[PDB]
Amino acid sequence: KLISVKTDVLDLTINTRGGDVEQALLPAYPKELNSTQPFQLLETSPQFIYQAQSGLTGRDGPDNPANGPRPLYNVEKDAYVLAEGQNELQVPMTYTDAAGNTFTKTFVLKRGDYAVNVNYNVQNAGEKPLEISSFGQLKQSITLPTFRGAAYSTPDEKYEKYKFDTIADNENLNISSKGGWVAMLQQYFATAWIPHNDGTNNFYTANLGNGIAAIGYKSQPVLVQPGQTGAMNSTLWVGPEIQDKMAAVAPHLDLTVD
Numbered sequence: 001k002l003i004s005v006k007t008d009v010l011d012l013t014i015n016t017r018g019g020d021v022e023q024a025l026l027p028a029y030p031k032e033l034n035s036t037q038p039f040q041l042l043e044t045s046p047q048f049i050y051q052a053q054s055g056l057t058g059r060d061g062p063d064n065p066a067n068g069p070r071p072l073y074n075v076e077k078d079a080y081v082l083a084e085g086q087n088e089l090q091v092p093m094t095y096t097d098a099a100g101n102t103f104t105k106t107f108v109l110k111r112g113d114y115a116v117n118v119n120y121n122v123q124n125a126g127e128k129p130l131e132i133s134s135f136g137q138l139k140q141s142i143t144l145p146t147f148r149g150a151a152y153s154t155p156d157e158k159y160e161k162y163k164f165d166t167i168a169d170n171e172n173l174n175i176s177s178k179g180g181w182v183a184m185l186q187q188y189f190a191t192a193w194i195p196h197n198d199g200t201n202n203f204y205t206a207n208l209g210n211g212i213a214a215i216g217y218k219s220q221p222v223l224v225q226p227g228q229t230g231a232m233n234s235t236l237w238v239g240p241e242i243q244d245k246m247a248a249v250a251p252h253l254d255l256t257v258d
């Protein structure tokens with residue numbers, strides 16, 4: 001099912017199968033000049049797709065399609081709203097696999113903030129180590145229903161654009177680095193995935209077919225030992241440039257809008 005997650009600046013629709021962001025509205029920004037309709041950044045419609053996907057892949061990650069269906073997470077409620085007397089809104093969802101292992105995925109949103117934390121906890125109830133990588137992917141229709149396209153950053157390269165035309169020509173990115181981020185850009189707004197780990201991340205683009213481009217990251221896998229709990233952290237930026245907030249999330253994220 002879909003759940004609604006709302007703060008003062010974000011209106012998100014999240015699919016509990018996998019935990020992808022299928023729609024994102026920015027209540028504070030007009031859809032069009034002189035409109036009071038909210039700007040729609042992420043969108044899933046028959047004409048257009050622009051989604052922020054994420055999960056746990058690697059050998060034992062439930063979102064790895066070899067491991068079975070995208071995990072259908074359990075939630076406490078269908079609608080989450082930031083309370084007047086709260087600074088933070090947490091949206092925890094839980095999935096138990098066949099073997100009894102527990103996977104918790106939590107979205108954390110803050111008042112006035114366009115950075116959404118997406119964090120995982122993995123409890124290993126079995127007898128073998130669980131090898132897990134987190135991933136974040138931004139996928140979008142190449143042609144719409146000043147630069148529009150993708151970008152990324154590594155500590156070394158700092159800023160790089162990647163054109164949708166290049167992806168459509170099936171020439172794709174495949175680079176690995178500590179730190180870094182990936183993004184999709186348009187005038188005034190960006191979406192970006194930012195891993196928070198100490199490993200070597202893999203950043204890539206893909207042509208997903210039917211005129212859909214993707215950019216994403218896959219983290220270096222970690223091992224969660226039998227009986228142990230493991231944690232994986234990332235941030236989704238979804239909104240306009242806010243220099244101060246962006247700088248604390250990742251170096252040079254401000255270059256996406258600028």
Ligand SMILES: [Ca+2]
Nearest residue numbers: 065066067068
């Ligand atoms: Ca299988």
Ligand SMILES: [Ca+2]
Nearest residue numbers: 059060066067
């Ligand atoms: Ca398996």
Ligand SMILES: [Ca+2]
Nearest residue numbers: 156157158160
């Ligand atoms: Ca270079």
Ligand SMILES: [Ca+2]
Nearest residue numbers: 157159160161
């Ligand atoms: Ca460059």
Ligand SMILES: [Ca+2]
Nearest residue numbers: 157159160161
């Ligand atoms: Ca270059």
